Amino acid sequence: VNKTELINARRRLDEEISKENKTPSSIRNFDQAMNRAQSQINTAKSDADQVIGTEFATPQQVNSALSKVQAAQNKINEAKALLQNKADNSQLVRAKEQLQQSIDSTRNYKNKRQAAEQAIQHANSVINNGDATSQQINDAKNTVEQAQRDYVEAKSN
Structure with a gap:
């Protein structure tokens, strides 16, 4: 067959x-x-x-x-x-920044730093799980990449 x-x-x-x-x-x-x-x-x-x-x-x-x-x-x-x-908020971010310049960032930075630490802990748990599925690995990778993107953006304003 x-x-x-x-x-x-x-x-x-x-x-x-x-x-x-x-x-x-x-x-x-x-x-x-x-x-x-x-x-x-x-x-x-x-x-x-x-x-x-x-x-x-x-x-x-x-x-x-x-x-x-x-x-x-x-x-x-x-x-x-x-x-x-x-939905893409990039133009809203730029508009908000322009308004700020025309006229809490620390809390937001700290929140995104914590999100990055939690993404690393989540990735480590998945990496160490021999039963992990392709879905779980890819989900954790996307979470890590999003946490990195968010962290860089929060530290940059």
């Missing part, structure tokens, strides 16, 4: 869904939907892994596992659809 489509669909279940530049509320919604779907996803992953590892798998077993994987992928895509892009 040709397992190509099942293998490819099974691998797609593990792909990172990017949270880069997504709103914090929409990320919460995504994580909440993924948790609701998690047992269905895990069962699809497990059944597909068994078929993939079956040396003499049948087309029926491949097709049944593929159907489960496709339904699990639809659940992931439903969760992904909750993610929303942040």
Whole structure:
């Protein structure tokens, strides 16, 4: 039997869904939907892994596992659809700075320094977790990069 489509669909279940530049509320919604779907996803992953590892798998077993994987992928895509892009505030930042010059930054700096320290602690926890998923690693990377961007901006005004 040709397992190509099942293998490819099974691998797609593990792909990172990017949270880069997504709103914090929409990320919460995504994580909440993924948790609701998690047992269905895990069962699809497990059944597909068994078929993939079956040396003499049948087309029926491949097709049944593929159907489960496709339904699990639809659940992931439903969760992904909750993610929303942040809106760009760069022109508002520049306008605010121009108004300030025409006429609390320390607290804001300290808040963003703390956010950077928390991002480093979160990254270390993920790095040290041998069970970490591609999604968890990528989420932590995006959090680190956002904390760096926010820190530089807060120390620069």
